Amino acid sequence: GMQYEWRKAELIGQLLNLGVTPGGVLLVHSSFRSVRPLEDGPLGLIEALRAALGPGGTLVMPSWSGLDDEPFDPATSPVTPDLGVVSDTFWRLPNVKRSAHPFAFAAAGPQAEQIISDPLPLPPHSPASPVARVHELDGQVLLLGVGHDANTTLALAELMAKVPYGVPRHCTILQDGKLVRVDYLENDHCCERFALADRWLKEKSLQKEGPVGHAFARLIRSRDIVATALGQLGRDPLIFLHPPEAGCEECDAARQSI
Ligand SMILES: CN[C@@H]1[C@@H](O[C@H]2O[C@H](CO)[C@@H](N)[C@H](O)[C@H]2O)O[C@H]2C[C@@H](N)[C@@H](O[C@H]3[C@H](O)[C@@H](O)[C@H](N)C[C@@H]3N)O[C@@H]2[C@@H]1O
Ligand SMILES: [Zn+2]
């Protein structure tokens, strides 16, 4: 309609009033469809995110390609479309370091290469993943117009709880001039039941909520996400799986994989 185009200074306040603190590590997942309109477009969001964190802060965003038969290059490989414009734009700006593997992240800040310097992580969200370095650095996770279905650290908690299901997934890189398929076993599914973490985090007062632009925003500490999901996965490791009653083809495949 005739909606308010948020300026940079107000976005900073919105970020500060949400819990974003300067000097920290902030991993954000965004759906710009819910943020818009902004006065400066998707760049205006990125500019505010780094303006609130300050120079001593480090902004981290997903930056993987999502393609399994195409090799990855941090200089050209576009972000998968499901990650949004903000993700696809952030890694192209000056001084934004990027991982050199298909499941790459993008980071900018004094701790950037502390986060993205690992080689190909198998599984994609293992320890020694960018998402695990955010955990190790006590970073924050900012859900930006997206639910916990996009919360990547939730998958890190799965492997940290030694979850039984492992489904065969693959990617490809360039080894000495030629392709090669790299087969691994990932712990993915529909990820719909990741929304269960909303009640888990909220009941423990671990999740900050509020507006960032027009989007609904969820801010949770990375270590608080892992810890919360650990205790819940320690109660039932299959709690993120759809029951066979629901007839979810994705989860039923993970279930059959012990
Ligand atoms: C094509 N690569 C992948 C595909 O694997 C494929 O495997 C077979 C061959 O390889 C194909 N025949 C089959 O069509 C397809 O299933 O499975 C899906 C599973 C879905 N949860 C999501 O994963 C998530 C990732 O697992 C997660 O690491 C990341 N955060 C983002 C994605 N949402 O996107 C991937 C991606 O689309
Ligand atoms: Zn499912």
Numbering used by the authors: 0 to 257
Question: Any passages from the paper?
Answer:
To increase the chances of capturing substrate-bound enzyme complex we used the catalytically impaired His154Ala mutant of AAC(3)-IVa. Using this strategy, we were able to determine the crystal structures of AAC(3)-IVa enzyme in complex with gentamicin or apramycin to 2.6 and 2.8 Å, respectively. In both complex structures, the electron density corresponding to the AG molecule localized to the cleft between the major and minor subdomains of the enzyme. For the AG substrate in both structures, the 3-N group is positioned close to residue 154 and proximal to the presumed location of the thiol of CoA. In the complex structures, the gentamicin molecule spans across the enzyme’s minor subdomain while the apramycin molecule is twisted nearly 90° relative to gentamicin. This difference is reflected in the rotation of the 2-deoxystreptamine rings of each compound. The 2-deoxystreptamine/II ring of apramycin stacks against the sidechain of Trp63, and its rotation positioned the central and III rings more into the minor subdomain cleft and towards Asp67. Notably, these two residues are contributed from the much shorter hairpin connecting the α4 and α5 helices compared to the equivalent region in the other enzymes we crystallized. Additionally, Glu185 appears to be a critical residue for interactions with gentamicin and apramycin as it positions the 2-deoxystreptamine ring for modification through interactions with the 1-N of gentamicin or the 5-hydroxyl of apramycin. Finally, the C-terminal extension of AAC(3)-IVa corresponding to residues 236-257 contributes to the interactions with both gentamicin and apramycin via Glu249 side chain.
Here, we conduct a comprehensive functional analysis of the Antibiotic_NAT family of aminoglycoside acetyltransferases. AG resistance is primarily conferred by three classes of aminoglycoside-modifying enzymes (AMEs): phosphotransferases (APHs), nucleotidylyltransferases (ANTs), and acetyltransferases (AACs). AMEs permanently alter the AG substrate, preventing them from binding to their target, the A-site of the 16S rRNA in the bacterial ribosome. The fold typical of the Antibiotic_NAT family is evident in all structures, composed of 13 α-helices and 8 β-strands, and determined structures superpose with pairwise RMSD’s 0.8–1.0 Å between 197 to 266 matching Cα atoms.
